[PDB]
RNA sequence: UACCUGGUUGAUCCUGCCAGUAGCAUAUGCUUGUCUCAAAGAUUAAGCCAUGCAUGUCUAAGUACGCACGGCCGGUACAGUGAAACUGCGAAUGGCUCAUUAAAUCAGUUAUGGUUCCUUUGGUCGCUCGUACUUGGAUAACUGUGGUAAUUCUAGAGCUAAUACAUGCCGACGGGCGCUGACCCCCUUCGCGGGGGGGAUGCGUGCAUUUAUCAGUGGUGACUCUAGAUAACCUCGGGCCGAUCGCACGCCGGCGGCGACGACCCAUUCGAACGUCUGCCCUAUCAACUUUCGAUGGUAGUCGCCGUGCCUACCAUGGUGACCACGGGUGACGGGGAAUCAGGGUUCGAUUCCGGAGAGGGAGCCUGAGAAACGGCUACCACAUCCAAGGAAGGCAGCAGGCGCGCAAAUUAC
RNA sequence: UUGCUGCAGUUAAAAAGCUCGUAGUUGGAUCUCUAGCGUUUACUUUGAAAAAAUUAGAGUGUUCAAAGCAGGCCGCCUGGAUACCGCAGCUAGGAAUAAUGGAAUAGGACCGCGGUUCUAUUUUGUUGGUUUUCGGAACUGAGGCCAUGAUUAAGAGGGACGGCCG
């Protein structure tokens, strides 16, 4: 189906989709009730999340991921994986001997929820810490700001 | 000495990691409970914190829920038909979580008859064996006649379940990990996913 | 290392006990109990070092095993039992009752109380939860779990408990213009009045406290304990009125006394 | 105390190093009256060890028919001290050493809303509707007969205990609450029929466990939180719902106070384990690396105390890199610190506090809350002890002490 | 005599034979708040957090001192302070200095105006069926206003053209 790519059936675990409906409501329309939660630290849940048909267990709005710890930023460098992106973090390390700086970068893999559609390389993204999701992914994309 | 340690893996960058400490106890794993169909054989293993974990080696009977009207019954597991992860376990008859399992239809039908008194999985002409006639066409007081007449409107089972009842066995997805909890519990498939798993089971062969 | 540690080296013990270097290699090692190892006081220290009753370690267990010492109206023979903040130590042999309050410089002071005041204790509620047929529950800083609390008691409020029973007599809300005491950090043992709190979501809440002598300082929410309603305390204070007076007038006071 | 002085020339002014000068550590020489404080087999060999010792333990309160003692009172089950043994707990701390280890260890900072937790300290413990005034079988200790050259080796025979190992009931208990529901009453209806009460007989019921559904007491920055409702489930390798001990004795045949052992589960304390961000020495005569045999990510499971390529299956072709990846070296355990010193710096940190690691080298595991334990076991590899040649028993990088190694380090003490 | 503070490179040892060029470093004037903000940092000042021992340092005649954490008065009055703790991570002020951008085929700001879909769960004493507004969104058909919107043109640099020059 549109949402159905894999071998197993995709569905939000909290949502039940087999209620006894009478014909006046059955033949009228078809729509599954979409589950979403508000992450705490003053982040508005995007409209495409509360309206969309995507199924993702690692989405912070529409999955089983609670955001707690550090909130960082980064610039998108590679969007070449399935629902996860490589972001770069640039900073200046102070050497006290010379009393000068040196620039250094860190590349971290963050999970990008499929709500954030039509997001391009080069723009800045604010990411939130969560429980580990893969070998290297510990951070989840909270909001995008265009370059 | 099965290990679920991180330090035996390569780094993100791709370089090898040299281990500083040899394998610990808390890093141990155990062999997989390849849980077959057959009479109840469950072994227990002592785990961290001195707790117990029920390793079900061969399960026959588990309880499944009919969610659309909310009624759960103990049922004899018939056969494993489809497995999302790997196709080998479908041939070996191995029970794991989120595997599709044909189960017996007896208690749900008996519940439905005792609740509504409308025949399910009955053919046009089977002769009523003398025991069900005092559930289907039983006499009662006018209050209970009216009370049941009210339930007649609601009771309308979906077409997808009818042929399964007529065959006398339901498709059911296991929700309990039988290797860890020590039992094969779950739910009978219904609606969109029933059709998805039907067309997938048909496509497999 | 494997399993839990049983010993504690002398120099590794918390500074507010004031153990000297040469006496030994090990320390008291407060045993598991209501208060944290870092922020408690072994009875061996209180008897031997503070009250000067016992000389050696044997005399302390010779005192305790004769069952002359109660903590919060309950007999404790364990010489390394942790008695912490607001705990009332009772010696009914000599009829002496002590409450463990931190002094100005940030350590447990030998502050005596009347036997009539050794009946209750103040306690800060850590959490509030409900379970099993909804009898709500409360948990406090000294680990006393109490059933059926007053629904006006919220988290970070203070409760006054009668020691003979285990029931709440009265409670103080954590609001602006209330007498508090600091139990952690640089400002440990300073008494003052709340001015405001600055809520930092997903981080530690910081509160501003004004002292009686016009001194204003900040502290983390976790290291605050409400002791009085308005400005009037519900317990006796130490020798000093929790006023952090500086080294200049510390010297002036010391030289004035001479 | 922000310091300089000799040395190239026949003489001069330079660049420049060699030499001098002071401190600090290791060695070593010669010398050595008093007194306090005090490091000390780290460097080389984490090389090898004779011998002795370093982890054991009992209260009034789990088990006392050892005359090993004497004592009542003599028809009083058990006066008491108490060896031995069964049972409980500890032995995972401490001590030693620095081989390993280069985003690893470790340090500062945050997270477990993703997990376990002996113990202590609180809470809970007739909330469950179905022989009890105490149930069953054995085995130590002891006695008696033995084997082997041999060890903290043990077989056979005869008794006997439990807080060991099993089994298992009254009581609270009268009922209430969800369902199923023959019969009875009331109003309207000419009547049909419609609406409102009462019911005996059957079913299940509490907390914990596993799954599915419904509704939204208290809390969070945010729960798929906590609690509540509904249908059920509940492992014979069984989960709670007390067959236990001690001291004091009372009140009108029952009812009781003060403890001690226990106990499913929640909280707490001591932690532990996985993570988050930032930080490390030299090397390009190491420039591309990783992905056949998991490398980076996706879906589903397995395994685990849980989060996760931890592992399996099927897919995608990713992930890191001159901001120095990957590889190699280190006379590298990492910090708190030490020496020196105008200001800046340089060098050291095996070593008493914190964290990590290993007990000759690897590997595998029993018991337990906690070990991949070595003063626990099992195997191999290297060394080596006894021997009747059949077999038996090994682990000092614990304290002494010895051999070796070397320039380099103490007493088989109380 | 390893030079960041702070060294050399015409002849003492030393500037690549020469030019281009990616990464690296450096870079010209100019702009005086309505429970959410303001364009985001670096920088700087303050706050909490940060184990003792060590180091600095207060008190104290160890007989003096290195030390120690004691002690002092005729049952008493005392002390066991205080400071520093790179970097990074949290917190609140400042806005010079240094990066970044806010409107250019105007889908630009600010104001009232037309409609499409859906929904809030107050309302016709309570209760069942239709239609509503209010509360709150994306999409648009127009309109008024902005003193409507582009700083300068480096004795910086590219390019254009003009007459020569070697």
Curated annotation (Swiss-Prot), chain A:
The modification Citrulline is found at residue 21. One of its GO terms (molecular function) is structural constituent of ribosome. Gene3D superfamilies: 2.40.50.1000. Keywords: Acetylation, Citrullination, Cytoplasm, Lipoprotein, Methylation, Nucleus, Palmitate, Phosphoprotein, Ribonucleoprotein, Ribosomal protein, RNA-binding, rRNA-binding. A lipid is attached at residue 59 (S-palmitoyl cysteine). It comes from the Eukaryota. The modification N-acetylalanine is found at residue 1. Belongs to the universal ribosomal protein uS17 family. This is Small ribosomal subunit protein uS17. It comes from Homo sapiens (Human). The lineage of its organism: Eukaryota, Metazoa, Chordata, Craniata, Vertebrata.
From Swiss-Prot, chain B:
It comes from the Eukaryota. There is a cross-link at residues 169, 192 (Glycyl lysine isopeptide (Lys-Gly) (interchain with G-Cter in SUMO2)). The modification Phosphothreonine is found at residue 129. It is a lipid-anchor. GO terms for cellular component: cytoplasm; cytosol; cytosolic ribosome; cytosolic small ribosomal subunit; endoplasmic reticulum; extracellular exosome; focal adhesion; membrane. The modification N6-acetyllysine is found at residues 36, 127. The keyword RNA-binding does not apply. InterPro entries: Ribosomal_eS8, Ribosomal_eS8_CS, Ribosomal_protein_eS8_euk, Ribosomal_Se8/biogenesis_NSA2. Keywords: Acetylation, Cytoplasm, Isopeptide bond, Lipoprotein, Membrane, Myristate, Nucleus, Phosphoprotein, Ribonucleoprotein, Ribosomal protein, Ubl conjugation. It holds the Pfam family Ribosomal_S8e. GO terms for biological process: cytoplasmic translation; maturation of SSU-rRNA from tricistronic rRNA transcript (SSU-rRNA, 5.8S rRNA, LSU-rRNA); ribosomal small subunit biogenesis; translation. A lipid is attached at residue 1 (N-myristoyl glycine). GO terms for molecular function: RNA binding; structural constituent of ribosome. PROSITE patterns: RIBOSOMAL_S8E. The keyword Nucleus applies. Its main location: cytoplasm. Component of the small ribosomal subunit. Identified in a IGF2BP1-dependent mRNP granule complex containing untranslated mRNAs. Part of the small subunit (SSU) processome, composed of more than 70 proteins and the RNA chaperone small nucleolar RNA (snoRNA) U3. Belongs to the eukaryotic ribosomal protein eS8 family. Component of the small ribosomal subunit. The ribosome is a large ribonucleoprotein complex responsible for the synthesis of proteins in the cell. Part of the small subunit (SSU) processome, first precursor of the small eukaryotic ribosomal subunit. During the assembly of the SSU processome in the nucleolus, many ribosome biogenesis factors, an RNA chaperone and ribosomal proteins associate with the nascent pre-rRNA and work in concert to generate RNA folding, modifications, rearrangements and cleavage as well as targeted degradation of pre-ribosomal RNA by the RNA exosome. This is Small ribosomal subunit protein eS8. It comes from Homo sapiens.
UniProtKB/Swiss-Prot annotation, chain C:
The lineage of its organism: Eukaryota, Metazoa, Chordata, Craniata, Vertebrata. CDD domains: KOW_RPS4, S4. GO terms for cellular component: cytoplasmic ribonucleoprotein granule; cytosol; cytosolic ribosome; cytosolic small ribosomal subunit; extracellular exosome; focal adhesion; membrane; nucleolus. Transmembrane segments: none annotated. InterPro entries: KOW, Rib_uL2_dom2, Ribosomal_eS4, Ribosomal_eS4_C, Ribosomal_eS4_central_region, Ribosomal_eS4_central_sf, Ribosomal_eS4_KOW, Ribosomal_eS4_N. Pfam families: 40S_S4_C (PF16121), KOW (PF00467), Ribosomal_S4e (PF00900), RS4NT (PF08071). This is Small ribosomal subunit protein eS4, X isoform. Component of the small ribosomal subunit. The ribosome is a large ribonucleoprotein complex responsible for the synthesis of proteins in the cell. Part of the small subunit (SSU) processome, first precursor of the small eukaryotic ribosomal subunit. During the assembly of the SSU processome in the nucleolus, many ribosome biogenesis factors, an RNA chaperone and ribosomal proteins associate with the nascent pre-rRNA and work in concert to generate RNA folding, modifications, rearrangements and cleavage as well as targeted degradation of pre-ribosomal RNA by the RNA exosome. It is found in: Cytoplasm; Nucleus, Nucleolus. Keywords: Acetylation, Cytoplasm, Isopeptide bond, Nucleus, Ribonucleoprotein, Ribosomal protein, RNA-binding, rRNA-binding, Ubl conjugation. One of its GO terms (molecular function) is RNA binding.
């Amino acid at each position: 189906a549109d949402i159905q790519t894999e071998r197993a059936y995709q569905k939000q675990p909290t949502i039940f989709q087999n209620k006894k409906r009478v014909l006046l409501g059955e033949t009228g329309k078809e729509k599954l009730p979409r589950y979403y939660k508000n992450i705490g630290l003053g982040f508005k849940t995007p409209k495409e999340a509360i309206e969309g048909t995507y199924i993702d267990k690692k989405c912070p709005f529409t999955g089983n991921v609670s955001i707690r710890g550090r909130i960082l930023s980064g610039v998108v460098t590679k969007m070449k994986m399935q629902r996860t992106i490589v972001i770069r973090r640039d900073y200046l390390h102070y050497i006290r001997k010379y009393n000068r700086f040196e620039k250094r970068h860190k590349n971290m893999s963050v999970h990008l929820s499929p709500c954030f559609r039509d997001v391009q390389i080069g723009d800045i993204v604010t990411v939130g810490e969560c429980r580990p999701l893969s070998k290297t992914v510990r951070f989840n994309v909270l909001k995008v700001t265009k370059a | 000495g099965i290990s679920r340690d991180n330090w035996h893996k390569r780094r993100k960058t791709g370089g090898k990691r040299k281990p500083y400490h040899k394998k610990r106890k808390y890093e141990l794993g155990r062999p997989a409970a390849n849980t077959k169909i057959g009479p109840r054989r469950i072994h227990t293993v002592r785990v961290r914190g001195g707790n117990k974990k029920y390793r079900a080696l061969r399960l026959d009977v588990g309880n499944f829920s009919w969610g659309s009207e909310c009624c759960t019954r103990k049922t004899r597991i018939i056969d494993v038909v489809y497995n999302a992860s790997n196709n080998e376990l479908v041939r070996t008859k191995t029970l794991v979580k989120n595997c599709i399992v044909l189960i017996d239809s007896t208690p749900y039908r008996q519940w439905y008859e005792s609740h509504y008194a409308l025949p399910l999985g009955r053919k046009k002409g089977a002769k009523l064996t003398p025991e069900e006639e005092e559930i289907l066409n039983k006499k009662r007081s006018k209050k209970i006649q009216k009370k049941y007449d009210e339930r007649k409107k609601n009771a309308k089972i979906s077409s997808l379940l009818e042929e399964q009842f007529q065959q006398g066995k339901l498709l059911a997805c296991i929700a309990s990990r039988p290797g860890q909890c020590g039992r094969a519990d779950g739910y009978v498939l219904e609606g969109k996913e029933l059709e998805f798993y039907l067309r997938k089971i048909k496509a497999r062969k | 290392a494997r399993g839990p540690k049983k010993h504690l080296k002398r120099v590794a013990a918390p500074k507010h006990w004031m153990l000297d270097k040469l006496t030994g290699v090990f320390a008291p090692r407060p045993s598991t109990g209501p208060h944290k190892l870092r922020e408690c006081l072994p009875l061996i220290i209180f008897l031997r070092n503070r009250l000067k009753y016992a000389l050696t370690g044997d005399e302390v267990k010779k005192i305790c095993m004769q069952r002359f010492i109660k903590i919060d109206g309950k007999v404790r023979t364990d010489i390394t039992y942790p008695a912490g903040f607001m705990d009332v130590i009772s010696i009914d042999k000599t009829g002496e009752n002590f409450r463990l309050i931190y002094d100005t410089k940030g350590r447990f002071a030998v502050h005596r109380i009347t036997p009539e005041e050794a009946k209750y204790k103040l306690c800060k509620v850590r959490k509030i939860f409900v379970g099993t047929k909804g009898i709500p529950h409360l948990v406090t800083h000294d680990a006393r779990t109490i059933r059926y609390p007053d629904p006006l008691i919220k988290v970070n409020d203070t409760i006054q408990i009668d020691l003979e029973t285990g029931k709440i007599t009265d409670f103080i809300k954590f609001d602006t213009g209330n007498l508090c005491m600091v139990t952690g950090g640089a400002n440990l043992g300073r008494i003052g009045v709340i001015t405001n709190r600055e809520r930092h979501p997903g981080s530690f809440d910081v509160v501003h406290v004004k002292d009686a002598n016009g001194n204003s300082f900040a502290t983390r929410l976790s290291n605050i304990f409400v002791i009085g309603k308005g400005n009037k305390p519900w317990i006796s204070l130490p020798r000093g009125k929790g006023i952090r007076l500086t080294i200049a007038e510390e010297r002036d006071k010391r030289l004035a006394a001479k």
